[PDB]
Amino acid sequence: PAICHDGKAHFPREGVFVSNGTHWFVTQRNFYEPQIITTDNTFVSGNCDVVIGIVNNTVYDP
């Protein structure tokens, strides 16, 4: 459902959070287009407690 980083929950502005076995990517809902999570790809709002199912991961800041 979301990605945790520095105590901040990251949600995909458009697309779906996916992983193959190890690496995390965000892709659309009608075509598998894997792209690395980037600040411009997600928006942060809140903390890593209210959500259920959040996954610890790193985010790459451009």
Add this chain to the structure above:
Amino acid sequence: SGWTFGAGAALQIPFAMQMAYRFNGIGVTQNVLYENQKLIANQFNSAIG
């Protein structure tokens, strides 16, 4: 699946995640549901009840 099983092959979709995409179809951001999904469930079942 949600809305997928009418277009073509039915792709599995977590129901907690299906709502966030249904909320996003009404101009309501995804994190609105996730932050209070317990209230959503508690309130949806009461209305069905």
